[PDB]
Structure formats: C-alpha cells, structure tokens
Design a protein around this ligand. Structure first.
Ligand SMILES: C#CCN(Cc1ccc2[nH]c(N)nc(=O)c2c1)c1ccc(C(=O)N[C@@H](CCC(=O)O)C(=O)O)cc1
Ligand SMILES: C#CCN(Cc1ccc2[nH]c(N)nc(=O)c2c1)c1ccc(C(=O)N[C@@H](CCC(=O)O)C(=O)O)cc1
Ligand SMILES: *c1cc(=O)[nH]c(=O)n1[C@H]1C[C@H](O)[C@@H](COP(=O)(O)O)O1
Ligand SMILES: *c1cc(=O)[nH]c(=O)n1[C@H]1C[C@H](O)[C@@H](COP(=O)(O)O)O1
Lengths: 305, 305
C-alpha cells in the first residue's frame, strides 16, 4: 500500500474481512448476505475541508447531496428525488413494494414518516406526504443547531429518526437511526479559534456495497453543513455499525474494487457564504463545490428491495 | 500485568487516558469533567456464564439487578428502588431536583417516562408513575424476545428509550439510549447448538467512575436474561460511548483504583429454570446467583446531580 494510512482502507479492509470470515445468513430481501456484528467503528477526519467520498469506485455525489437536503427539508416523498434524477428510493417507494408491506393506501413515492419527518417533526401525527407539519412535532435538527451555538458542552445533542410507534407506517425502518454531535471548546492558548465539531452515527444495518458509501458521505456532509451554520470547524466523523453485511450478489463486484488503490479524498467548498445560505434550510445542491474528486470507474451493484 | 488480556483493562485504560489527555470541560452539574468523544468501544465476552462485573472496586450488584428488573417492569417510580434499599435514583427523583428542572408538579420519586416506560410503552401518553399503561404503547422488549425466537436474522432487533417528544417530561434524558441484539445461527458442524446472542449498547453520556460500572453489568445481565427466555447462548456485549468523561471529584479516587489488578470475572447462574421464570417479566432478584465475585475494596465517589 503506497499509503497504508489512507482512511478508505477501513472500508476496503472490513469488506475483505466480511467476505473472508463473515457468517452466511438469510435476510428480509431474500438474496442473502455474509455478515459480522458490531465491527470496529470507522473514523474519518473532516479537517482541512476534507470530504470522505470513496475513490475506489465512482460515487453518485449528486445523489448523496440531493438525498441529504431532502432529509433536512423533512420531506418524505421520493418523487422529489426522482424528479431531479435521483432514484435511490424508487425501489422502496414503488407502488409494488408499498402494497407488498401493507401500505397499499399510499400513492407511489409516499414512504411514510421516515428520516426527514422524524428529524424535523418527531412525535407529530403523520397523514400522508402532503400533510401540513410546519411547527408540529419536535424539530431535532434546529435544536441541535441552537445547542451547538448556545450550549456546546451539552451532552444531549442528538438527531434521531428511530420511532418505534411510527415504524409500521414506514416503507423501510431507519438504517442510520441516529447520530450524536460533540463540540470541543477552543484550546486555552488560542481562544479565538473555532470550536471543533464531531459526529458519531450509529447504523443498525449496513449494506457495505451500496449503502455505506452514501451514509459516510452523507453524514460527513451534514456535519460540514451544521459547522457552517454554527460557526464551528468540522473535525471528525465516526461511524458505528450493527449488522454489517455484504449481499451475495455484491461479492464478485466488490472483489474488483478491493484491487484498487484509493486516491486522496476530495475537498468541500461552499459556493455561497453563511449569510447568503442563512440557516440549515437554506442549502442548495449547487452550494456544494467538491474539488479534487478523482475516483476509479463505477462498479455496478444491484440493490435488494 | 499478570493477565494483560483481562477485559477490565479496557475500563482502567480508558480512565487513565481521559485523565491524561482528556479535555477539561464545564457541564450541566457544575462540578466539571475531563472528557473524550467516541473512544474505541468496549467488548466483553458473555460466554461460559461470564458476567463482566468490575473487580477493581466493589460494585453494588444488588443495586444493578434491582434497577434492571425495575426497567423491565416499565416502572418509573424511584420509590420502588429506595424501598428495597437502592437509592441510585434518589438524587434525580428528589423534590428539589424535580422542581429544579420544571417538574415541581410531580411527587418525589416520579421520574417521568424514563427508561422502563419507553422500553415497554413507547408512544403511550404519560400521566404520572401510577398511571395504567398496561397494553398501551409499543412493547419493544417483548418484540425483541419474539423476534429473536422466531426471526433471528431480523436486522431491527432494537430496544430504545430515546424519545425526543417525552424528553422534557423526564427528570433526566436516557444515557444508555438504545441497544441492538444480534443472533448468530448454529454452525453447520452442529445445527443442534444454541444460537449465539450478542448486544451492542450506545451510551451518549458516560460517567466512568459511577455509571459505566453499572451500565456494563446491567446490559450484560439483560442479555443473559433474554438468552434464557429465547433459548439462546449469551456471546458478546459491546459498549460504544459518546461523551466519555471522568468527573473532577472522581480523579483522585480513580487513581487509587487504577493501581489494582483485576480478578477473574464472576459467573452467573439461575436459581430457577426457564419454565419457572416463564418470561422476561418473571425474574426476581434472588434468581440471580453470582458466584466467584472477588472484588477489591469499595471506592467512594460522589454523584453529581
Ligand atoms: C444509504 C443510502 C441511501 N440509499 C437508500 C437505501 C434504500 C434501500 C436499500 N436497500 C438495500 N438492500 N441496501 C441499501 O443500501 C439501501 C439503501 C441508496 C439506495 C440505492 C443506492 C444505489 O443503488 N446506488 C447505486 C446506483 C446509484 C445511482 O443511482 O446512480 C450505486 O452504484 O451506488 C445508493 C443509496
Ligand atoms: C448507570 C447507572 C445507574 N445510576 C443512575 C444515574 C443517575 C444520575 C447520574 N448522574 C451522574 N453524574 N452520574 C451517574 O452515573 C448517574 C447515574 C446510578 C446512580 C448512582 C450510583 C452511585 O452513586 N453509586 C455509588 C453508590 C452505590 C450504592 O448505592 O451502594 C457507587 O459507589 O457505585 C451508581 C449508578
Ligand atoms: C438502509 C438505508 C441506508 O441509509 N443504508 C443502508 O445500508 N441500508 C441497507 C441496510 C440493509 O441491507 C437494507 C435495509 O434492510 P433491513 O431494513 O435492514 O432489512 O438497506
Ligand atoms: C446517566 C445514567 C446512566 O445510566 N449512566 C451514566 O453514566 N449517566 C451519567 C452521564 C452523565 O454524567 C450524567 C447524565 O447527565 P447528562 O444528561 O449527560 O447531562 O449521568
């Protein structure tokens, strides 16, 4: 390894380990997987505007950003993603899947009270994706922003989408069920510096081939976004996994990826200022300027619904 | 070290690290702490009836068991613990503290919809600790039991007390906010063996001196309990921490503990059979037979309310 310390090796090494000593298991989708439970967590530095966007394969960056802004908006209609050319949620939002999980009364694309809804309206009563939820439920995301700015040492800076009561209304239960932010105060020797912002996310189920690449970049981006609005400096992103698995039909495609040497991670820059963006709800896809992204070729992998 | 691989060194080493390079910070209690965010997780083997009850200091075992059976029962009245000689929750259940956090309308000891209530009645409306919640809300615990027995490869075996909507009603927000169970199927070379049960718990805020010792034994015991009811074999317990800290007034007392060499962990045996206990709600303090516990002397540490 030209550069053995490249953070991407964490991802490649775990996949190799799962394939090697993982346990073959049946699963909800019916395709089957090989898995390990609670492996060591991943750590990615977010310093110097670094964005841990995997380079051993081309990652659909725009899809990650679109999905993230979608979460932030509190929207749960997958059509808002497919209309802009992002179909990652088309599979679980299809009329065929919804009816399959007992949600036939919903129009196609209406995923239910998933991620975004819990993030901005936790506890509110869900009708459909067109419902008026403004000012209803708990806005966890804004509370996180307010807390980081006015009481950084607080120990409850949590953002969670897990809701046992709403689960049956969801086309799919949250995979990244929650994350915790931490703010390091400016060192004594130089109190003018910006506090450092870190994020730990826990993912109950992890599709290493398809999902993890998105999850890693997504939460890294969320932390960068929150850092901008709170005048803090992104520091570290930690990802703890529960059921970490590699789908059976992903094994061969991933072996090809395992042969590739990572390129230095790209950097993130903002196309607009903090003032122009305003708050967490003012970001736009075009605001994300990712430079230096130099990935290898794309690797085709089918998603199991 | 006579036994460098003793699992208790994970706990001792982390405390040493926090004291050495941890960051000095202000906190809600006002006593102050030294902390590190998201340190490597702890792993404890639960095989061969092993119970990771710390030995470098005498741990109030009966108090751990009592609190756990209290959680399971869904009860939120701290008087149910103090009446049996366990006052770990007297501090946050006292009238002064309750009135202090805006809950003066509650009788002393009524902590609100904390741990146990969320575990067995998530989503139900909370009135007071005497309310009738039977059959109300989501019983996450029993669902976990049923899932382990009938669909072990499920990836949603989650037990969580985090409830953004109910937080303000709680004397204190959940520290151990959730855990995930995992079941390994019997290997091919012996399909008669019992499936192996593991548990990963995530704790947002960790008082290493006082809380962690209880948290470790508590979730280890919970896994042993669930294993009995589900005909599975306890395997491993993983603990991931968020804000890992040592209170200022615990530093000196802990230094004394750091000088001690761990004794082999004790073992857990049941005073009754699975049939006699019946289900997760049938356990009694006397059912827990811990043998071989050989700890060093107690170490006094004050809890910051
Ligand atoms: C995590 C997350 C968000 N999600 C949502 C989501 C929904 C159901 C899931 N189901 C399964 N089995 N695995 C998943 O990772 C998963 C993820 C994603 C969904 C699909 C892809 C995907 O198929 N990507 C392909 C094609 C990308 C493209 O459209 O160009 C890829 O090659 O990456 C990525 C992320
Ligand atoms: C986690 C958890 C449950 N809890 C609940 C709970 C509630 C508020 C808290 N607040 C703070 N600052 N730290 C805590 O760990 C904490 C824990 C506990 C509460 C007290 C002790 C404690 O004082 N232990 C002393 C005395 C033991 C005894 O009563 O005999 C000790 O020496 O261990 C331990 C656990
Ligand atoms: C879910 C969504 C996400 O953001 N990331 C993911 O990796 N996934 C994966 C996990 C799993 O393979 C599948 C969901 O299936 P299940 O609910 O765990 O049965 O999507
Ligand atoms: C909370 C309860 C528990 O089970 N274990 C714990 O260690 N604690 C600790 C963490 C922290 O010191 C305090 C809770 O205060 P805060 O909500 O984190 O501000 O108790």
């Amino acid at each position: 390894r030209s550069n053995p310390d490249h953070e991407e090796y964490q991802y490649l090494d775990l996949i190799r380990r799962i394939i090697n000593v993982g346990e073959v298991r049946p699963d909800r989708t019916g395709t089957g997987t090989v898995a390990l439970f609670a492996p060591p967590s991943f750590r990615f530095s977010l310093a110097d505007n670094t964005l841990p966007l995997l380079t051993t394969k081309r990652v659909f960056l725009r899809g990650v950003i679109a999905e993230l802004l979608w979460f932030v908006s509190g929207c749960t209609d997958a059509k808002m993603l497919s209309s802009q050319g992002v179909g990652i949620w088309d599979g679980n939002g299809s009329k065929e899947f919804l009816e399959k999980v007992g949600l036939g009364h919903r129009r196609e694309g209406d995923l239910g009270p998933v991620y975004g809804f819990q993030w901005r309206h936790f506890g509110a009563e869900y009708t459909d994706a067109d419902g008026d939820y403004k000012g209803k439920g708990v806005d966890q995301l804004q509370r996180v922003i307010d807390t980081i700015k006015n009481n950084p040492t607080d120990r409850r800076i949590i953002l969670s989408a897990w809701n046992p009561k709403d689960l049956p209304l969801m086309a799919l239960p949250p995979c990244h069920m929650f994350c915790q932010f931490f703010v390091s105060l400016p060192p004594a020797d130089s109190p003018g510096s910006k506090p450092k912002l870190s994020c730990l996310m826990y993912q109950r189920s992890c599709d290493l081939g398809l999902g993890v690449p998105f999850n890693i970049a997504s939460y890294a981006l969320l932390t960068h976004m929150i850092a901008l609005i709170t005048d803090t400096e992104p520091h570290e992103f930690i990802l703890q996994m529960g059921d970490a698995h590699v789908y059976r039909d992903h094994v061969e495609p991933l072996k090809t990826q395992l042969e590739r040497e990572p390129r230095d991670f790209p950097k993130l820059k903002w196309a607009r200022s903090k003032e122009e963006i305003g708050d967490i709800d003012g970001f736009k896809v075009e605001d994300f300027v990712v430079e230096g992204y130099k990935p290898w070729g794309k690797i085709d992998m089918k998603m199991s619904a």
